[PDB]
């Protein structure tokens, strides 16, 4: 669970010669195409 | 849109909004104007 709601943590990283912020933009785009009632957030290293 | 009553709205706020708002930056106490749903067993003493 994350912030009181059911969750699933997903770890990953940027491919060679790609910034982390650029890698995160794609995960946000892919997350927008998921089913109804599914959101997302960033935690840990990605939060700060 | 007349789909949700006063009671339906209060439950949605209680069960999806209140907790996250109550853990938000700089938020002290949080008062719900309404009540969360519970399973109500409305007993009948004649049938009992």
From Swiss-Prot, chain B:
Report the gene knockout effect: Loss of susceptibility to contact-dependent growth inhibition (CDI); inhibiting cells still contact the target.
Inducing or repressing factors: Positively regulated by MarA, Rob and SoxS transcriptional regulators (at protein level).
Subcellular location as annotated: Cell inner membrane
> So what family is this one in?
Belongs to the resistance-nodulation-cell division (RND) (TC 2.A.6) family.
What does the record give as the function of this protein?
A: AcrA-AcrB-AcrZ-TolC is a drug efflux protein complex with broad substrate specificity that uses the proton motive force to export substrates.
Kindly state the subunit structure of this protein: Homotrimer, with large domains that extend into the periplasm, interacts with AcrA and TolC. AcrA may be required to stably link this protein and TolC. Interacts with AcrZ. Part of the AcrA-AcrB-AcrZ-TolC efflux pump.
Q: What is this protein called?
A: Multidrug efflux pump subunit AcrB
* Taxonomic path: Bacteria, Pseudomonadati, Pseudomonadota, Gammaproteobacteria, Enterobacterales
Range covered out of full length: 146 to 193 of 1049
């Amino acid at each position: 669970r994350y912030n009181g709601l059911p969750s699933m943590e997903i770890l990953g990283q940027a491919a060679p010669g790609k910034s982390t912020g650029e890698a995160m933009e794609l995960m946000e785009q892919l997350a927008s195409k998921l089913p109804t009632g599914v959101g997302y957030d960033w935690t840990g290293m990605s939060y700060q | 849109d007349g789909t949700m009553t006063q009671e339906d709205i209060s439950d949605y706020v209680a069960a999806n909004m209140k907790d996250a708002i109550s853990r938000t930056s700089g938020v002290g106490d949080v008062q719900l104007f309404g009540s969360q749903y519970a399973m109500r067993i409305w007993m009948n003493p004649n049938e009992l």
